[PDB]
Design a protein around this ligand. Sequence first.
Ligand SMILES: Nc1ncnc2c1ncn2[C@@H]1O[C@H](COP(=O)(O)OP(=O)(O)OP(=O)(O)O)[C@@H](O)[C@H]1O
Ligand SMILES: Nc1ncnc2c1ncn2[C@@H]1O[C@H](COP(=O)(O)OP(=O)(O)OP(=O)(O)O)[C@@H](O)[C@H]1O
Ligand SMILES: Nc1ncnc2c1ncn2[C@@H]1O[C@H](COP(=O)(O)OP(=O)(O)OP(=O)(O)O)[C@@H](O)[C@H]1O
Ligand SMILES: O=C(O)CCC(=O)C(=O)O
Ligand SMILES: O=C(O)CCC(=O)C(=O)O
Ligand SMILES: O=C(O)CCC(=O)C(=O)O
Ligand SMILES: [Mg+2]
Ligand SMILES: [Mg+2]
Ligand SMILES: [Mg+2]
Lengths: 112, 112, 112
Amino acid sequence: MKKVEAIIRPEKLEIVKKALSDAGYVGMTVSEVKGRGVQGGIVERYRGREYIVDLIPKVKIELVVKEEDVDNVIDIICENARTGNPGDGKIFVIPVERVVRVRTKEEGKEAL
Amino acid sequence: MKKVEAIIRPEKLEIVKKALSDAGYVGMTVSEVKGRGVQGGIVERYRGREYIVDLIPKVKIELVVKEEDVDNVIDIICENARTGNPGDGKIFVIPVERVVRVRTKEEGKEAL
Amino acid sequence: MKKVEAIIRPEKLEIVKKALSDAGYVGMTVSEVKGRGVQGGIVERYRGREYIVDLIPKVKIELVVKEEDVDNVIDIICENARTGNPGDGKIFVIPVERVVRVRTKEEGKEAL
Ligand SMILES: Nc1ncnc2c1ncn2[C@@H]1O[C@H](COP(=O)(O)OP(=O)(O)OP(=O)(O)O)[C@@H](O)[C@H]1O
Ligand SMILES: Nc1ncnc2c1ncn2[C@@H]1O[C@H](COP(=O)(O)OP(=O)(O)OP(=O)(O)O)[C@@H](O)[C@H]1O
Ligand SMILES: Nc1ncnc2c1ncn2[C@@H]1O[C@H](COP(=O)(O)OP(=O)(O)OP(=O)(O)O)[C@@H](O)[C@H]1O
Ligand SMILES: O=C(O)CCC(=O)C(=O)O
Ligand SMILES: O=C(O)CCC(=O)C(=O)O
Ligand SMILES: O=C(O)CCC(=O)C(=O)O
Ligand SMILES: [Mg+2]
Ligand SMILES: [Mg+2]
Ligand SMILES: [Mg+2]
């Protein structure tokens, strides 16, 4: 099992989660975050002066899935989250050693 | 060292954190999140029409602990977070390779 | 690749992120959290009575970096986040097995 952690534009949550759900990837945790990447933020202008805004709102989605499904999850996220402009997102894959469903104490792949 | 990441009902935070603390599991980070599991959300009715609400508020708790304590932490969370209805929670165990206390630069088990 | 996850005082975000950026560590995700450590919270007094506040606001910063840079990232965070009083922060290092830039589908170290 692996956690796919993707930080994406807030306005892309709806299309990404629909595309994931349609492909069978339903279990997901969503968090509001702020961040920056390589570019260090965005340049804005106020009264003729340019300045850097160095933290931008994003949404973090976390999906724990079987390892064999990671490629497809990443492909779906990238296809649907992309706009072509810097800031479209970053994905990390993090190992998950155990998964437990609280209600039933099921573990493993059936507990996803 | 392992991170126990549990996503549970918001109204179960108090009883879960009390039970963990009573058993000696104190260090914890709490985050407000939204999510869905297998069921894909909840069915609601508005003016006779049923629709799906596909993200539900939850609370994420993260406890970094010694590996030997993971079983007990999971047992405590499940016992106290359960209600018997879908949505009671999901737990992931994620490896933690290093722990550092900022104030003192202590590392390892004593830094938990 | 490794995720450095640091939970620090909210009022230290600015100096920590500036120091990290100055040293070349730019990519970062920031989350608002609450937590407690060893001390279990803070003692407060209201109308002569002392009570425990057991969750304190903090900021979580997450930086995914090359393994060889983890030591330096931790050193920078600790130097700039410390005040000398309990609550200055906790850092966890979590393995990251894959990194993908959404816009370009780049992976690996160049996608950081
Ligand atoms: N190395 C990293 N560590 C932590 N979070 C990161 C990192 N890289 C990016 N992020 C998070 O991902 C979000 C989106 O990053 P972003 O798309 O800007 O990446 P990028 O590498 O700059 O690529 P692009 O050139 O397409 O902008 C950031 O706002 C931040 O929350
Ligand atoms: N595979 C998963 N990946 C990411 N987060 C998940 C996943 N499964 C569940 N979650 C998170 O855990 C929360 C609680 O899940 P939930 O209890 O509904 O799990 P479930 O597998 O549907 O079990 P149940 O049948 O008891 O509802 C979700 O709202 C979501 O935040
Ligand atoms: N073992 C842990 N698991 C989860 N989160 C933790 C843990 N230890 C600390 N944290 C998080 O880090 C924050 C800061 O912790 P803190 O600085 O109080 O650590 P500490 O071990 O008590 O050290 P100090 O004695 O310097 O206070 C907490 O409020 C919490 O969010
Ligand atoms: O996040 C944005 O929308 C643009 C800024 C960006 O790509 C960054 O800081 O890396
Ligand atoms: O989270 C709820 O309370 C019920 C909905 C649920 O279990 C889910 O989407 O998996
Ligand atoms: O977080 C604080 O500022 C002090 C309380 C503390 O260190 C703790 O609960 O461990
Ligand atoms: Mg960018
Ligand atoms: Mg469910
Ligand atoms: Mg403390």
